[PDB]
Every structure is written in structure tokens, then in C-alpha cells.
Symmetry: D2
């Protein structure tokens, strides 16, 4: 269990960007800029800085050329400069390794703190950032599948209750989760900005980054991305969806970039800003909890996730999840799921829904 | 092979309605009227007459209470009264059993001819029909998943080339089909009204009715139907989709009514009215031919289909398809499919795409 | 009045393209290609050939450099080559001027007939046309405001009943019209292809081309066009809309190109292929007849229209309309229009709706 | 000028509900429930409590039967119960009239404070509220024009800079405003919850409530509202729109209820939660500032607004605006507005855009 520090927690505003190491910068560029239409804030032979349509801070994604594809940093912007200090004292009290550069680790970012948090994830906290032209009304640049905002991250970690508690102490509030009757927690969504989540914990071997998610204005914007991937003959890069999530109620799509980093295009979840926002708990066996329409969750979604780096550039060692696997308890040979609780009709046993 | 009659073929306008036998009228009513929102033109204890939002003829669907769920008639409206006679002479020349009632077989229809066509399907041809209020502008009745028109039928039959030829002689023109390099034809789409199809042939054991299809105005109308089925906890009744078809380029969804009759909600295919409309032929192994995004085609889609009746009310005997099964050659243990022709990467062998 | 020829009418399929004379090729290209995203089938220093997203014939619009902006030809495609011959004989029996070129009048068209019809409009009939790549599934090229097909033309002529009889004899069927309780007809819509219209007659001084119309897949594609024009600071070139039409029930938008040729973006009207399709007749004073939401019709919409050229390139003399003018009768000094028949609330006397 | 209290301001979360006095409960119910589809949380012969689709607090709108249609209270929810106490002390230090009821002023609300603020508006602060069923996934109840959340209020006050300072001291942050090259401010938008605004100040005679605003998921949901109103022959109750706002970039529509209270349907504005969110300032003469497409702003939109009641139920005296009026300065006899700064084309002198 992770202790609650005496030091006051920093006031986190929202997830702001992620820095991903990629192996071939040109292929990645083609995927992110040519296929997805993200806007370049800056680029050189080692990195590409990307921002979504409505963003004003410098970037929501940093592609960094490297030998091994992995997550290098997931960054949260804090409310004031002083919160960067509060973050430094907070993680030191927790005994975590931290590093601080008064002029940032990446272009366009100012004073920043990076840490190997208790779950082994490289987190960044910063306030100062370079403002860039906010393209929210540049309709002459609007593509049919325009990505408008960065919305959340999703982390794969072994013990969800352990991570939940630590993030709750950090100020994130849980909006939805998934449990079973034997007391096992499989996943939790937590927020800071007022949407369903800024980050989430998915139970599994970790530390690993499950995905980064961007949102679109409307559902047809997500449909366009699939259509365009079909036209480009890269539909094998569409991993799952599109669909309507049960948890978070958002319309979604998961695709894979050149190095297998998973990207989620998401839209239309609901407001959670009120402090007494009602928490929704879903049963792991409810076949409408992940996909509201009952579609099977592809197995690679549960098994495949990106590696993460420590502050030295090395890949973090992966810890095995000891609790029940969501995949095993639902689509494994000894798992089951239902459409209607207690109704054998429309339920599945040791088999995925829809005949697979 | 089916001979081309000397008698002139009737001028068929479009598919107009289908009469389906159902086992429990109240359950079926709940599905078609309460869930799907079709509009009642008339109903009594034995039948329910339904029409879509923009229809002016009496009905696009007739639910008839019966002991065995099956297709009783798929009806095409012809251009003039005289075409009903031309249809009578045409099928008699073909040696088919025909029946004709100067006042229709169902309410709201006038002089009509029903036949057991060369493929064993009960076809109806009629001109006269009762006009009803056209609801195209009754926005006060518009539901979020409004079905606006009846678009096509899809027939399951053993020998596609055999049926194609007969329908071509009847005046339908082929817009798209699916073949392989060994000369096997798996399916064909043919039209009369200017859209991709009024009917289609799907290779398999038959005669069987694969599905009836309705269209919506926009793609979000189709999304709403899935969402509503999730809210009602009947997502197990969603068989496949939604998706973008490769063939026909339409956005689609397949759902199952209480008796397993398959309904397709479809939208936005293209114009085919020009006589030299370019025909598109797809390779059976192209994984983007059915679902443009690469999603696996659920096996029940290929195996399950509705029974059809002869003119006496008996179920037609089913003939086995002798040619290669589309399911076997693509997702069977000895089948394969590709994303990019000639690229092993993104191809599937004895396994369905997406991990199933 | 215009006589019904003895010669059989040609079999018309649909409106196929319009040839417009523009004064500055570069500016027009900017509008039609960069702003609207139409696709270039061919271009040189004198002309630009554009086609919509789902078209397979050579083009839907020909921009020709000339000294006076005007309409040079509105082309309809006929069913067979012989129909061109039938069209020639038909117009000759009408005593109209004809001109035939077996090699066509513009690139991409073959044997074709151009005539100066009875209403003074330059109509072209043709069958042969060079097939080009149908871009209907090129989602990698799909813009957020993609124009997918050419839908109709709209002509301004002095006497509507007169032109109507002529076009009905030619095979066009009226779907909707606007009249007053005194028999004066203000406008008629007629089709060949099964949508509300291929062309329409708007009462006013003519001959003049009121507008050419393209359609999109969904309503949001039309919103994008408006949004993009705002971003490019050319919102003054948006004349009227977006709105919902009363007549035709389609979502619409009217914009002006560099020489003031009016272009309508249009979507989702209904099926009219059945020969007994019910005709709708709106009263001219009904304020929901043109814009279903009661938005006022801009004055220029009734007064400004494009000039038409005779076969020698001269501008056709304009004949004054003698019957009541729709503008005067509804939004003029002594105009009147209502929301509900007989209700004083929601009615407008001598002014437009909404306070203008 | 209004003094900045010494007492700490209460922590405001978002606008939560408006209590409107209506003269005929039955007619208003028809409008808000049957026409708009808002959900009834509770009702009796004197009041109707309505909530939007995704709300979990008791209600977003209270319709109260009374003799003079007016605004009785605009309520903001605060972070904690103690914030109510903080609000009371804050307003008392301002010398404003306060009234507190530990049992609340309307059903479903607990301890609450109502005050007659410095601008003469009846504001309510509260934390406790009865939780009800969050209908966010009840797709079986989702209408084609579903209102999903309450978004903002809009107040008409004489002096904008004055009210702005007061609200900034209260914790609101300005996101956008409209000014002229002469320092006169015409309107300001300010938020607490991270969207463009929770409330706004429109210059004009006040206090008056300009409108309450709800949002939808997508643009087509707003189109449906317009279409439905046309079907119900009440299009005269559509005041302005639909359009795209310049300020806020949201898709919008303004309708009038039975007593003429203005309701705005609104969607897709952007994120403003970061404390250094860039402020946008539009020039009053810029014709794309209110309607991005340059459509004219209806006169009544600037002159008509709802009355507000003091805490005793009397109508608040209305103070005349002394600064230039936005209407006069842009569409009046000596008004002026432009599409492009300095360009004579697309500019309007002494008249509205589009010819009115
Ligand atoms: Fe996610
Ligand atoms: Fe189909
Ligand atoms: Fe038109
Ligand atoms: Fe507003």
C-alpha cells in the first residue's frame, strides 16, 4: 500500500501530452500527420511535436526517435508554477526518483518535473508552456476525421486498488469501475478535468501504457477514420471498434501506430465535475460493459500494451498481475458473460459473444 | 440453365414489400413497432402492415401470424397494370406455377401475381396499391433511428450464375459481385431502381431469404438503433455491424427479429441508373470486400437464413450449394483473406481477422 | 403554347453536366477546386472539367473562359446513342435550332446534340462519354464538405405552365409546385431520375439559369462548407441558408461563385420513381414552403440569375414576366405570408419573416 | 463600481438551474416536455421540474405558475455546503439583500441562499440537491433532438465592464468579449466550469434574462428541433438560427417559449479550463462575430429579454443603457458591419447582411 504524503498534493488540471519513443520517424510521421491529420507545432530530425485542432498549449504528442518503442512520459499540466514544486516535494516524500529541469525536457515546455511514480510510470508535471495558434476555427484546415483534443491516458498495472488509492490521494476522483462479486477489481477510471477520465487503470502485467486517446466533435468523424484506413489499405491497423463503450458511454475506436502504440479516438462522454458525481460500478461479466452493443473485445486489446521507460531511458521491468484476468473470466474457456443478468439466453460460456 | 422467354419481361420498378410469417404477433409487433419504429398502416389479430417514413404505398412489410416463421412473398411493384399480365405470361412460359387474384393477396394491394420462380422463391408483382399518408415531413414523429425506405432483399441460392442470368433476362442489371480466380462466383447484386440493388444473390443452401433491408437518412441513425438495443438489453439480437460495406459502399447493420428473420439497416450507397454503370468485381479473399474496415463476418451470417414458402404454404425443400463456400474459403481452417493483395502482413489463414 | 411532337421523345436519364462561361479561370478554379473540393478530370488554359465524388462520367461541370459570364449549356444524358437521333428529330419537329457534332462540343463527350429549346435554353443531349475513375471509395480524398453528385438545374422562365407542358411532353414528371388560390403557378419541380427533380422552373424574367445543384452525403457536410467559407472570410458569398426546404424536404445551401453563378449544395430529398408518385402543391403565401423553418428568402435569390447563351455565343434576350412575382406577393410592400393559415400570429404583412 | 469583498468568494462549480415564472402551466408543459423532450423530475398543479438527459441533480429548470412571466432565480451549484455560508457572507459584505432557507426554495434543493445581486439579478447558491436517475444511457428514451445538459445563462445589463469586474471577483474568467476601437464593451462571456461560459453579459437595458441555454450531442440534433417545429406549424417561435457562432464557435439555435422566454440550443464550443486560456476579443463591426456565416442578427434578439423578479416577487426596475447599442451600431440606420476589414465588398451600411 502507498502512504498518503503529509506534503500537499499538486493541483493537477488535466492530461496534457505524452512523449512516445518511436523507431522510424518518417513512418510515424506519415501515420500521425498524413493519416490522422494532427498539426505540427515543430519538427526536426529527432522529434515531431503534434497538437490537436482546439489545443493552444505547444503540443499534445511528442514523437521521439529511439532504439526501442516505448512511452517516455505522460504529462499533466498543473494549475500554477508553485504546483510544480508541490509535486517535487510530494514525490520525494513518497520516496520516488525525480528529475527537474527549469527549462523543460522537451521543446515548448518550461520548468518541469519527471518522476518514476509508485507504479513505475514516468509522470511529468509542468505549468509553463509555449502558446501556439489555437486552430479551433481554422475550418479551412478541418479534415473529415479531425482530432480536436487530447482526452485521457490508460495505464496497465497489476493491482488496481493499489493504484486507485494512490491516484485518489493525488486528487483524481473515480467515476466508473469494473468489479466482480468475489471482490476483484479489474479497472478504474479517474478524472481531474470534468470528463469521465484523464487517466485509467487497466489490470494486467505492467507498468505498460495501454493507450492515449483523442477526441473528435462527432461520431461521423470517427467513422471517417475507419473509412480512410480502408481506402489506404491499412484496415489491419484497426484493432477494435468502432463502438459505443458501456463504461464512459463514449463512441470509440482503437487503432495501432507503426510501432504498435495504441491510439483511441473517442467522443461524447459526460460531465463529472460535481464532487458528488455518482460512481458507476459494472460487473465483469456484463457483456455490455466494454462494448454497449455486445461486440467481442479482441484478445490483443487485453494482452498487448506499450513498454514504458524509467528516467535513464531503460525499459521498466514488468510485474505479473496476480488477480483474475478480465480476459480469462469473460472470454477464456472458463469465463462467461451475459446480456441480461441471470438469463442463460444471450449469455456466452468459454466463448466470445457473436460466434467467435 | 434458365431459358430466356419469348414473352416480353414485365417492367419492374423496385422492391416494394415483403410478407413474413411470424409465430407470435405481439412479440413481433414489439420489435418492429416499439423497437424499430415502423409505422402501422393497418393491423388486426392476424396481421400487421408496416411502412417506412417516406413511403406512400400501403406498406413495406406485412407480418403474418403463422405456425412456421418463413418468407411468404417478396414483392416488386411494376410500372403499369399491363405489366402484371406480362408477368403472368412470362412465368407461365418459364413453366412456373402462378396464382393471380384481381384483388390482391394482402390488404392494400390490388391485382397481383404470385409465383414460385425458377429458384423456388415466392415472388409477387403488382401495380395497384392503396395510397396512405406519406410521412416524409412528419418530423413530430421522426425517431432518432428512423427507417425511411425499404431498399433491397437478399436471397440465398446454390448456383449464383444460374440465378444471375435469369434475373438479368428479367431486366435487373448487375452492379457488383464477388468471384475468385478459379472461376467461382459467390454473390451478385442487381438493381432496377438506380441504387446498388433491389435484390441480391448470396451463394449457399437455398431457397432461403437472407434479409430484408431498410435505410436511414444518416449514419448516426444506424448508431442509434444499436444504442437503443443496448439500453433495452437485447444487444444479443445485434448480429453484425455496424460497419461500412466494401461491396455497395453502404454503412450497415444486421439485427435479428423475434423469429430470427434478419433485418439490415443500410445507408448511403451510390447511383447506378446509367446503363453503362461500371461493374465492380471483388476477390473473395479481399478482407475488405464485406466489411471495408476488416472486421470479421460472424459465421452465422453465412449459415443462418430464413425459410421460404411455396404457394400452398409449405416450406420449400433446401438444395445444397455444391460450389466453394465463402465462409470456408475465407475464415475456414483452409481459407485465408488479405488486407493488401500479395502481402503476408495483415493476411489471415484458417483464422478470422482481428484475432478470432 | 408548345405543340406535342409526333416524333418519339428521347429517353432522358438525368441531368449530367453544366458548361458555364467564367471570366477568370484562375479565380473560378480557386472557388470550385480549393474551396469546394470538386475533382479535376482535365484542365488547360481555356477550360476546367470537374466531377463530383461518385461520378464516373467525364465531368459534371465545365468551366469555360469567356468574356461574359453565362450558361452555355445544360446537358442531360440519354439512355442510348439512338436517343440523340430521336432528340434531334424531336426538336426539329418543334422548329428549334439544332446543332450536332459527332465528336462532341467539349472534351470527354462524344456524339452530342445542342439545341436552343422553346424556352430559349441551351440544352444538350448525349450518350457517349469518357469513363474516368469513380472516386466513391477514395476516403483518402474525402473532404469534410465533399460534393458527391450533381442533382438538378433550376431555370428562370416567364411562364411556368407553358414550360411545364413542354417538359412533361419530354417525359419529365412534376413532383411539386407552388401556386396561389387564383391559378397562377409560381414554380414547378420535375424529374426523370427518381429524385424530386433534374430541373425546375422558377417564374421570373428569362431565360436565365437560376442555379446548378450538387448534393452531399449528410447535413453536417453542408455545415462544413459554411464553416470553411467563414474561415476564408468569404461568408458574403453565402447567399441563403443553410435551411430545410419545404418543397422537396431537402437540406440546402446557396452560395455564389466568382462570376455570381449560384450553386446550391443539397441533400436528402425523397424517392419519386413510381409513376403515380403523389404531387405536392404549396400555396405561395405559406411561409414554410421554401424554408421549412420560416427563415426569410433573400431578395437577390428572386432577382439575380445567370444569363444564357444562344448557340452562337450571344446572350439570349430576356423576356419580362407578366404574372405576379413571388417576391412581391410574399415579402414585398404589399406582400403577405403566414405560418398557420388564417392565424394572425406568425403572419407577416409587407415585410419578411423574423423582423426584416 | 463594485468593491472586491474581503470575505472569501464561494467556490462555484457551474450554472445548475433556472426557475422561470410562466403564466399557463399546461402550455409551457407542452413546449418543454412534448416539443423539447425535457424530462419531468416532479410536477403538480403549480410547478414542473425538468432535467436534461445527462443530469443527476434534481432539475435544470423549474417552471412556476405566476401572473407575470419573468425570471425568479438563476442557480449556481457550489463545491461544498460551507460555500453557501461563504456566499452569504460575501454578499452581505457587498450590502446585497440575502435570504436563506435551510430547507431550500424549491423541491429537490436543500440549504440554499438567494440574493439580489449588485446588477439586480436573483442568484441562488446551493450545494445539497436530491439525486435522481441519470438518464445518460437511456437510449430507449433518447429523442432525435435530445437536450443533454444545461450550459449557460445570458444576462442583459446596462454596463458590461462593471458587471464583468464583479463576476471576475466572484471567480468567473472571461473567455471572449466584443468591443469597438473606442473601448466600449458590448458583451462578455465568462466561465467557471471549463466551457466558454456559465453566464454572459449582453449590453442593453436591464436587469433582464436574455436566455437560458441547453446543449445537444451533435449538430443534427439541433436541426431536428427546427424540423419538428416546422412540422408542428410553430416555426414562428424559431427566433434566430440555426447558425455557427463566431464568439464561442458553438452551433446554435434560439427559440421562444409560450411566455417568450428565450431558449438557446447549443453545441460544441471548446475547452477553457486552463487558467491562462487565451482571451478572444471581437470588434463589434465584424459581421462574423455572432453568426460565423454572416447571417443577420434578428432585431428582437437585441431588444426583447425576460423580466427578473426581486426576492419579494416584484419585477425589477429596468435601467436604460447609455453606451452605444450593438443593434444601432451594426444594423441600424447608421450602422455598419464588414466581412473583411477595410474591404468595401461584403460590407453593409445602414442595413443588415443578405439584403434586409
Ligand atoms: Fe480509453
Ligand atoms: Fe444487404
Ligand atoms: Fe434547387
Ligand atoms: Fe448563449
Amino acid at each position: 500500500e502507498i502512504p498518503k504524503p503529509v506534503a500537499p498534493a499538486p493541483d493537477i488540471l488535466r492530461c496534457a501530452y505524452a512523449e512516445l519513443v518511436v523507431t522510424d520517424l518518417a513512418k510515424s510521421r506519415n501515420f500521425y500527420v498524413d493519416v490522422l491529420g494532427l498539426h505540427v507545432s515543430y519538427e526536426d530530425e529527432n522529434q515531431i511535436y503534434l497538437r490537436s485542432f482546439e489545443e493552444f498549449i505547444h503540443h499534445n504528442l511528442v514523437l521521439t526517435k529511439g532504439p526501442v518503442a516505448a512511452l517516455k512520459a505522460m504529462a499533466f499540466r498543473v494549475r500554477t508554477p508553485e504546483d510544480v514544486d508541490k509535486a517535487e516535494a510530494y514525490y520525494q516524500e513518497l520516496g520516488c526518483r525525480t528529475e527537474r529541469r527549469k527549462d523543460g525536457f522537451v521543446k515548448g515546455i518550461g520548468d518541469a518535473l519527471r518522476v518514476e511514480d509508485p507504479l513505475g510510470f514516468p509522470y511529468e508535471f509542468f505549468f509553463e508552456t509555449t502558446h501556439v495558434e489555437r486552430l479551433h476555427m481554422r475550418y479551412d484546415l478541418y479534415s473529415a476525421g479531425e482530432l480536436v483534443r487530447l482526452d485521457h491516458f490508460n495505464q496497465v498495472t497489476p493491482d488496481v486498488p493499489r493504484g486507485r488509492k494512490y491516484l485518489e490521494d493525488l486528487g483524481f476522483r473515480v467515476t466508473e469501475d469494473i468489479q466482480d462479486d468475489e471482490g476483484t477489481t479489474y479497472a478504474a477510471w479517474m478524472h481531474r478535468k470534468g470528463t469521465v477520465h484523464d487517466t485509467a487503470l487497466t489490470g494486467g502485467n505492467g507498468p505498460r501504457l495501454h493507450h492515449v486517446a483523442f477526441s473528435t466533435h462527432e461520431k461521423h468523424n470517427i467513422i471517417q477514420i475507419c473509412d480512410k484506413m480502408g481506402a489506404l489499405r491499412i484496415s489491419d491497423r484497426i484493432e477494435r471498434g468502432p463502438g459505443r463503450h458501456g463504461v464512459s458511454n463514449a463512441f470509440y475506436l482503437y487503432i495501432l501506430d507503426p510501432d504498435n502504440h495504441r491510439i483511441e479516438i473517442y467522443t461524447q462522454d459526460y460531465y463529472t465535475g460535481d464532487p458528488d458525481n455518482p460512481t458507476i460500478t459494472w460487473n465483469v461479466h456484463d457483456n455490455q460493459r466494454r462494448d454497449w452493443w455486445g461486440n467481442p473485445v479482441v484478445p490483443s486489446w487485453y494482452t498487448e500494451a506499450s513498454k514504458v521507460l524509467d528516467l535513464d531511458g531503460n525499459v521498466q521491468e514488468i510485474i505479473e498481475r496476480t488477480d483474475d484476468s478480465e480476459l480469462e473470466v469473460t472470454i477464456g474457456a472458463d469465463g462467461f458473460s451475459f446480456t441480461r443478468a441471470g438469463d442463460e439466453d444471450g449469455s456466452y460460456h468459454g466463448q466470445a459473444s457473436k460466434g467467435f
